Amino acid sequence: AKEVTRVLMVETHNEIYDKFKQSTHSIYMFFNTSELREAVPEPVLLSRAELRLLRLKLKVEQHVELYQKYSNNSWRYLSNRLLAPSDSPEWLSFDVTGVVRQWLSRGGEIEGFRLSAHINGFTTGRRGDLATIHGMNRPFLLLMATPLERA
Amino acid sequence: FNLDVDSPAEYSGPEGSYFGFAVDFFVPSASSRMFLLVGAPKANTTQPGIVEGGQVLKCDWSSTRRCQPIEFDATGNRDYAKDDPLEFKSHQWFGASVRSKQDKILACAPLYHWRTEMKQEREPVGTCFLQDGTKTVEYAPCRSQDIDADGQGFCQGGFSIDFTKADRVLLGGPGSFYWQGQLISDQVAEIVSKYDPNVYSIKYNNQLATRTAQAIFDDSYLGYSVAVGDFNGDGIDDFVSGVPRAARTLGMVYIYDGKNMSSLYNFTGEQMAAYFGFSVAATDINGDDYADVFIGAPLFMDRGSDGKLQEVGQVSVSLQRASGDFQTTKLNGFEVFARFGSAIAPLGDLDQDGFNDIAIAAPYGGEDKKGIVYIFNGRSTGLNAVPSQILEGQWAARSGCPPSFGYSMKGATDIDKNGYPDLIVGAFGVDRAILYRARPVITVNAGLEVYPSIFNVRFCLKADGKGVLPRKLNFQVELLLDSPSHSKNMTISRGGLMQCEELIFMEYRLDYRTAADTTGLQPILNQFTPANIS
Amino acid sequence: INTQVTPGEVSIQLRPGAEANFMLKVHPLKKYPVDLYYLVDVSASMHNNIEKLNSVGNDLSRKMAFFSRDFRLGFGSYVDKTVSPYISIHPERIHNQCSDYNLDCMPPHGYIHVLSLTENITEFEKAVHRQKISGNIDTPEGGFDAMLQAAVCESHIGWRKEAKRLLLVMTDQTSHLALDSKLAGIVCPNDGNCHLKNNVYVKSTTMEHPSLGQLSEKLIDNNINVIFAVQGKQFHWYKDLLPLLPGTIAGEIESKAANLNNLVVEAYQKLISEVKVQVENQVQGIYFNITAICPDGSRKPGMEGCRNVTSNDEVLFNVTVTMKNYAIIKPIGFNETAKIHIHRN
Ligand SMILES: *[C@@H]1O[C@H](CO)[C@@H](O[C@@H]2O[C@H](CO)[C@@H](O[C@@H]3O[C@H](CO)[C@@H](O[C@H]4O[C@H](CO[C@H]5O[C@H](CO)[C@@H](O)[C@H](O)[C@@H]5O)[C@@H](O)[C@H](O)[C@@H]4O)[C@H](O[C@H]4O[C@H](CO)[C@@H](O)[C@H](O)[C@@H]4O)[C@@H]3O)[C@H](O)[C@H]2NC(C)=O)[C@H](O)[C@H]1NC(C)=O
Ligand SMILES: *[C@@H]1O[C@H](CO)[C@@H](O[C@@H]2O[C@H](CO)[C@@H](O[C@@H]3O[C@H](CO)[C@@H](O)[C@H](O)[C@H]3NC(C)=O)[C@H](O)[C@H]2NC(C)=O)[C@H](O)[C@H]1NC(C)=O
Ligand SMILES: *[C@@H]1O[C@H](CO)[C@@H](O[C@@H]2O[C@H](CO)[C@@H](O)[C@H](O)[C@H]2NC(C)=O)[C@H](O)[C@H]1NC(C)=O
Ligand SMILES: *[C@@H]1O[C@H](CO)[C@@H](O[C@@H]2O[C@H](CO)[C@@H](O)[C@H](O)[C@H]2NC(C)=O)[C@H](O)[C@H]1NC(C)=O
Ligand SMILES: *[C@@H]1O[C@H](CO)[C@@H](O)[C@H](O)[C@H]1NC(C)=O
Ligand SMILES: *[C@@H]1O[C@H](CO)[C@@H](O)[C@H](O)[C@H]1NC(C)=O
Ligand SMILES: *[C@@H]1O[C@H](CO)[C@@H](O)[C@H](O)[C@H]1NC(C)=O
Ligand SMILES: *[C@@H]1O[C@H](CO)[C@@H](O)[C@H](O)[C@H]1NC(C)=O
Ligand SMILES: *[C@@H]1O[C@H](CO)[C@@H](O)[C@H](O)[C@H]1NC(C)=O
Ligand SMILES: [Ca+2]
Ligand SMILES: [Ca+2]
Ligand SMILES: [Ca+2]
Ligand SMILES: [Ca+2]
Ligand SMILES: [Ca+2]
Ligand SMILES: [Mn+2]
């Protein structure tokens, strides 16, 4: 019923690897606010926002630590999740509605999330000549917002 | 230096089938007839739908040199589902590596493209066929549940195999863990007892193999060449593997333990990309009862007087001592672009002088690239630098791909029961397998007594030999002054005393007619003794 | 007759046991015509280097305009052998190796000659855009075979006898060695002849990778200067290969991967400033000893020769030919030769 939209992330080399070139400890996905405003202008019109990720074939143990960018100088904790030991590219969904709503009206240069431990669009896991190749379904921000005319 | 070059045993095979890629001897203990094993990976078989599958032909040594192939798996491709080929045996290169124990024959296909249970891709894992008597079994070490090139997808088993004296089989697959390598050693009894054609993983109970290394260790080609030898003196042969791609492409040799894969020693090449460890053999050379390590580098570049680099090849010999330290001696090549050191195979005590002998061959040397084989003897301190015998190929190039005579050879196995280990040389370019027989070696001592020196001339001599030899021998001598010459046909028995006589500088020639045996082997004189005194 | 090397030919007769030295003068010139070839890897590990190479075309001409007066540029690509286990022979992956990623990528190929050396540059910017990316499974990428095919096949590439040949090969990781093809099953060596049917190396599945020594000899015979533009950690590995390859130098590429024009300028300047000579002697009984003299005054005989030399700086090479058919002695990268004829008696 509600209109859906997708907000693609920045390129791994363009803006992701600007200062955080080697984020081995945690994979980082960055975004800028112009595309979020393009998806929907009204902050209140965002009924729900979701984060889509593609799981890998770990099948041993998955513990993801979710930090967020508060004023680009600190960290913010929201929640944590686990991945079932299944050898299949399962889809992951995170509830980041508040962060997206806050960032939509907050002017900034770049914003992102830390995924630490204590995937499609990144290194697949085959070391050598088949490691750095990118494919579709690159991590994006799924949005579910009502049209301005309807509401 | 006793190899017969005037009458070599020549074996033919299918045309354009790489007949001679892998040669080995077959000496069954139960029977008194010793056969031969040759490889032909590109030989068409009678299997349905299999093109150029390959076979291991077995040739007899008798006068009627007729040859026939051995039946190992006479069936088509297996099926996993309806209209689904479970196997891709076409171009499987079956018979690339052949190793034979007393009565066990192991033929291995390194291009056995087994589709996985779930991913069902044509990645070749590599299997082997072990036969001892009428019963035959199938051995698949690299076929397991760790699929894709991460663990064992491109394991390529059976590339290099060897048999341990302790009734054990060593298998090395260079393609495991993104071409890192593996060394899978299993007991023959377990494989023989547990043979279920229904199950494919065929997981074993006493299977020990090297685990995955670090990420930087990728492209190591471990298990490229395997050998067996005793180093720590515990009664079990250790494992030696050639590593020509590790150490940022420098060349290494890894020595493991047959008990629980413990790293005893290591080796490192001096030149970058010099193919250190391409072929490794473990045999004794100085008769100290310690198994030495022989390492050959086919593509080695050396600096000349003017600094011009030439690719002649280099072979390194390691002399093991009681303490454990290794003394490395480098043997440079003889001809440019000859690939000296491509194939190394021990010959044992070829001339029965106590010290064993080894052979190093250059498959692309000589005129028109006919292949050159060098025979090296053994000393107390290493081995003799200069070659003792030269073997040359008598066949030219049929096509652009050269014959490459001497690309692979087997030895250290007596066939004619003369006590001399004969050597077989197989060239896949011309599809021939040539066996060279060791001629009898007779050591002779000569002594001349003249008194007074200012007259009586009375020369004496004796003869001795090892193995089966004719009871009576014929020798021709001569006389020189300052009649000036006196010839005499004398007869000396083996082990006899001083055959002294007088006549009122000598040169002696052995008669090659009466001394020849029924087969046709003419005894050869010792090359290390002088033929003239004073 | 000869221009760079002063003596066209020297005929000296000598009895065995007596030495007879001569003079070999070398005078490098200025404004060498440049034929530069781009042997670039189009493997999957270079999704960014291909786009980095896009802008070299028009920009490098400005830099080369005041070193040389005429510039001719070509193009080339190579991935790897079209065999297993180097590539995937699966029915769905034999033609496209990016099916598992659902990506449109060029099928792997041993060597394809996209464009020859042309005065036109607009052809170069058209050629860089129409070629896609490729890839395969194993980490090493066969480049020595591409070098040998781009060197031997002079007619297809279009090398000029009067210009300074330049073959600039770009890689980031190690290349396949000669005997690595035993895993695939190819077990006899490369002959080294021309096998380009139609700008495609058809003999990529029946012959092994060329030897390092054979490749170096062919490069010396074809008077080909090689620049090893690399960006990864393998810069040290390719730097240690420079003594093995006469007349060859290697350069570094940053991660941001835009110093290609500067790297080419520096490589050209270094190649012009180095003068090394080796003798390819086949006459039996003669021994070659070379004594090089440097303009700086430091007597440095040997293969290294003299470095940091420019025009109007005459470099001397004292050679004393003795005795214990003709022998050709020539500098590496110089289009002229100094063939010496000796009286056999
Ligand atoms: C002759 O040459 C031989 C070849 O060079 C050489 O053999 C090498 O020996 C060294 C040490 O003797 C050995 O290095 C060790 O390798 C161990 C794995 O076999 C490793 O164990 C840890 O790593 C395993 C897998 O590594 C992955 O996972 C790790 C996390 O677990 C991660 O950190 C790694 O980066 C990699 O991704 C893992 O499964 C295992 O559980 C261990 O975690 C050893 O690690 C030690 O170091 C860590 C610190 O990093 C310490 O916590 C601890 O002390 C660990 O023990 C160690 O790296 C090579 O692997 C051998 N190579 C081959 C090939 O076998 C012989 O030793 C030489 N002989 C002589 C006499 O010199
Ligand atoms: C190796 O390279 C050298 C440098 O490029 C060549 O040397 C020069 O070769 C030019 C050939 O293109 C000459 O130009 C021509 O020379 C002839 C003299 O025979 C004149 O009639 C032509 O008019 C002239 N063409 C022009 C100027 O456009 C150069 O004169 C000559 N020398 C210099 C100093 O540039 C070598 O020839 C070349 N060697 C081989 C074997 O190709
Ligand atoms: C093995 O059998 C095949 C066909 O029965 C022979 O022909 C080869 O296979 C196809 C035939 O259509 C061709 O594409 C190949 O080029 C053929 N090979 C050659 C070398 O011509 C093949 O010759 C047979 N091989 C042997 C050793 O007998
Ligand atoms: C099994 O492996 C272990 C560990 O590699 C071996 O224990 C070492 O063996 C070496 C070889 O003699 C000794 O020098 C060490 O003192 C041993 N202990 C260590 C390293 O802590 C063991 O010998 C191997 N074999 C068996 C049967 O256990
Ligand atoms: C920033 O936002 C713009 C909006 O048009 C978008 O095109 C771009 O991809 C974003 N990321 C950048 C510039 O890194
Ligand atoms: C010795 O034997 C040879 C060959 O058997 C024979 O030709 C010769 O006449 C014999 N006698 C002498 C004196 O050589
Ligand atoms: C090649 O250069 C010439 C010289 O100006 C030019 O006229 C021509 O258009 C160029 N070729 C192309 C395809 O643009
Ligand atoms: C050749 O000449 C050099 C320089 O004059 C000198 O080292 C010696 O006379 C000779 N060297 C060799 C290695 O023959
Ligand atoms: C070259 O060296 C020789 C010594 O080997 C010397 O006699 C001769 O004078 C030298 N020639 C020149 C031009 O210096
Ligand atoms: Ca032992
Ligand atoms: Ca010894
Ligand atoms: Ca001996
Ligand atoms: Ca014999
Ligand atoms: Ca590759
Ligand atoms: Mn690559």
PDB file of C-alpha atoms in Angstrom, chain B residues 18 21 93 111 113 119-122 124 149 154 156 159 174 179 218-219 221 224 245 248-249 271-273 275 278 298-299 301 303 305-309 311 337 339 364 369 401-402 407 428, chain C residues 84-85 88-91 93 137-140 174-180 182-185 187-189 208 211-214 217 233 236-237 240-241 243-244 278-280 287-288 302-304:
ATOM      1  CA  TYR B  18      51.482 -39.507 -25.073  1.00  0.00           C
ATOM      2  CA  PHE B  21      54.362 -39.871 -19.992  1.00  0.00           C
ATOM      3  CA  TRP B  93      44.446 -37.453 -18.273  1.00  0.00           C
ATOM      4  CA  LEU B 111      41.758 -34.277 -14.184  1.00  0.00           C
ATOM      5  CA  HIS B 113      36.110 -33.719 -12.987  1.00  0.00           C
ATOM      6  CA  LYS B 119      27.100 -27.097  -6.635  1.00  0.00           C
ATOM      7  CA  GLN B 120      27.655 -29.706  -9.407  1.00  0.00           C
ATOM      8  CA  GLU B 121      30.546 -27.897 -11.084  1.00  0.00           C
ATOM      9  CA  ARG B 122      33.243 -29.436 -13.287  1.00  0.00           C
ATOM     10  CA  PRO B 124      38.610 -31.569 -11.022  1.00  0.00           C
ATOM     11  CA  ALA B 149      38.352 -24.068  -4.426  1.00  0.00           C
ATOM     12  CA  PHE B 154      40.529 -27.831  -7.332  1.00  0.00           C
ATOM     13  CA  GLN B 156      43.732 -32.114  -8.318  1.00  0.00           C
ATOM     14  CA  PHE B 159      49.392 -35.321  -9.467  1.00  0.00           C
ATOM     15  CA  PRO B 174      49.042 -28.859  -5.563  1.00  0.00           C
ATOM     16  CA  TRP B 179      46.665 -23.834  -5.162  1.00  0.00           C
ATOM     17  CA  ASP B 218      48.321 -18.717  -1.407  1.00  0.00           C
ATOM     18  CA  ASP B 219      49.665 -20.195  -4.655  1.00  0.00           C
ATOM     19  CA  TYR B 221      51.829 -25.699  -5.107  1.00  0.00           C
ATOM     20  CA  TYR B 224      54.098 -30.842  -6.593  1.00  0.00           C
ATOM     21  CA  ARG B 245      55.865 -21.082  -5.738  1.00  0.00           C
ATOM     22  CA  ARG B 248      57.087 -14.714  -2.959  1.00  0.00           C
ATOM     23  CA  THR B 249      58.028 -16.950  -5.913  1.00  0.00           C
ATOM     24  CA  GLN B 271      67.318 -17.206  -7.402  1.00  0.00           C
ATOM     25  CA  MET B 272      63.834 -15.761  -7.789  1.00  0.00           C
ATOM     26  CA  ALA B 273      61.486 -17.775 -10.028  1.00  0.00           C
ATOM     27  CA  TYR B 275      61.773 -23.450  -9.969  1.00  0.00           C
ATOM     28  CA  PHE B 278      60.194 -28.898  -9.185  1.00  0.00           C
ATOM     29  CA  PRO B 298      64.930 -26.765 -14.620  1.00  0.00           C
ATOM     30  CA  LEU B 299      64.760 -23.016 -15.367  1.00  0.00           C
ATOM     31  CA  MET B 301      69.722 -18.506 -14.969  1.00  0.00           C
ATOM     32  CA  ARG B 303      75.817 -15.184 -14.732  1.00  0.00           C
ATOM     33  CA  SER B 305      81.914 -13.849 -17.707  1.00  0.00           C
ATOM     34  CA  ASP B 306      80.267 -10.940 -19.549  1.00  0.00           C
ATOM     35  CA  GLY B 307      77.152 -11.009 -17.354  1.00  0.00           C
ATOM     36  CA  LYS B 308      74.889 -12.526 -20.018  1.00  0.00           C
ATOM     37  CA  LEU B 309      72.234 -14.662 -18.326  1.00  0.00           C
ATOM     38  CA  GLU B 311      69.094 -20.665 -18.844  1.00  0.00           C
ATOM     39  CA  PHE B 337      67.618 -23.976 -22.663  1.00  0.00           C
ATOM     40  CA  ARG B 339      65.937 -27.651 -18.849  1.00  0.00           C
ATOM     41  CA  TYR B 364      65.198 -30.408 -24.483  1.00  0.00           C
ATOM     42  CA  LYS B 369      66.066 -30.847 -29.162  1.00  0.00           C
ATOM     43  CA  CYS B 401      55.544 -30.115 -29.739  1.00  0.00           C
ATOM     44  CA  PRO B 402      59.023 -31.615 -29.158  1.00  0.00           C
ATOM     45  CA  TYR B 407      60.798 -36.218 -19.383  1.00  0.00           C
ATOM     46  CA  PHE B 428      55.503 -38.883 -24.848  1.00  0.00           C
TER      47      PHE B 428
ATOM     48  CA  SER C  84      41.206 -25.425 -16.512  1.00  0.00           C
ATOM     49  CA  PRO C  85      41.740 -24.913 -13.596  1.00  0.00           C
ATOM     50  CA  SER C  88      35.795 -22.350 -15.009  1.00  0.00           C
ATOM     51  CA  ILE C  89      34.740 -24.887 -17.640  1.00  0.00           C
ATOM     52  CA  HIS C  90      31.168 -25.068 -16.330  1.00  0.00           C
ATOM     53  CA  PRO C  91      28.566 -24.864 -19.139  1.00  0.00           C
ATOM     54  CA  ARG C  93      30.464 -20.148 -16.894  1.00  0.00           C
ATOM     55  CA  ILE C 137      39.472 -18.017 -10.995  1.00  0.00           C
ATOM     56  CA  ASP C 138      43.140 -18.357 -10.069  1.00  0.00           C
ATOM     57  CA  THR C 139      45.167 -15.439  -8.730  1.00  0.00           C
ATOM     58  CA  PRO C 140      48.149 -15.361 -11.168  1.00  0.00           C
ATOM     59  CA  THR C 174      52.315 -12.033 -10.011  1.00  0.00           C
ATOM     60  CA  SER C 175      52.222 -13.551 -13.494  1.00  0.00           C
ATOM     61  CA  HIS C 176      52.018 -17.199 -14.493  1.00  0.00           C
ATOM     62  CA  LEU C 177      55.369 -18.928 -14.903  1.00  0.00           C
ATOM     63  CA  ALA C 178      56.491 -21.254 -17.687  1.00  0.00           C
ATOM     64  CA  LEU C 179      55.813 -24.654 -16.090  1.00  0.00           C
ATOM     65  CA  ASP C 180      52.633 -23.682 -14.220  1.00  0.00           C
ATOM     66  CA  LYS C 182      51.526 -28.774 -16.061  1.00  0.00           C
ATOM     67  CA  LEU C 183      48.425 -28.552 -13.862  1.00  0.00           C
ATOM     68  CA  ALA C 184      46.343 -27.879 -16.982  1.00  0.00           C
ATOM     69  CA  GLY C 185      48.185 -30.605 -18.919  1.00  0.00           C
ATOM     70  CA  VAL C 187      53.802 -30.057 -21.016  1.00  0.00           C
ATOM     71  CA  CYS C 188      55.900 -28.883 -23.946  1.00  0.00           C
ATOM     72  CA  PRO C 189      57.559 -25.479 -24.287  1.00  0.00           C
ATOM     73  CA  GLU C 208      52.883 -23.461 -22.289  1.00  0.00           C
ATOM     74  CA  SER C 211      60.370 -19.099 -20.281  1.00  0.00           C
ATOM     75  CA  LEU C 212      61.771 -16.024 -18.559  1.00  0.00           C
ATOM     76  CA  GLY C 213      65.112 -16.459 -20.316  1.00  0.00           C
ATOM     77  CA  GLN C 214      63.473 -17.101 -23.686  1.00  0.00           C
ATOM     78  CA  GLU C 217      66.198 -13.147 -25.325  1.00  0.00           C
ATOM     79  CA  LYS C 233      52.799  -5.094  -3.096  1.00  0.00           C
ATOM     80  CA  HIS C 236      59.293  -5.310  -4.813  1.00  0.00           C
ATOM     81  CA  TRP C 237      58.927  -8.652  -6.602  1.00  0.00           C
ATOM     82  CA  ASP C 240      64.020  -7.852  -8.002  1.00  0.00           C
ATOM     83  CA  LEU C 241      63.286  -9.104 -11.543  1.00  0.00           C
ATOM     84  CA  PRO C 243      68.574  -7.723 -12.947  1.00  0.00           C
ATOM     85  CA  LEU C 244      67.134 -10.833 -14.618  1.00  0.00           C
ATOM     86  CA  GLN C 278      75.605  -7.436 -24.442  1.00  0.00           C
ATOM     87  CA  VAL C 279      77.203  -9.619 -27.115  1.00  0.00           C
ATOM     88  CA  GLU C 280      75.322 -12.521 -28.718  1.00  0.00           C
ATOM     89  CA  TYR C 287      86.247 -14.911 -25.685  1.00  0.00           C
ATOM     90  CA  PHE C 288      84.526 -11.555 -25.168  1.00  0.00           C
ATOM     91  CA  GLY C 302      80.483  -5.007 -17.264  1.00  0.00           C
ATOM     92  CA  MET C 303      76.848  -5.387 -18.242  1.00  0.00           C
ATOM     93  CA  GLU C 304      75.687  -2.416 -16.150  1.00  0.00           C
TER      94      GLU C 304
END
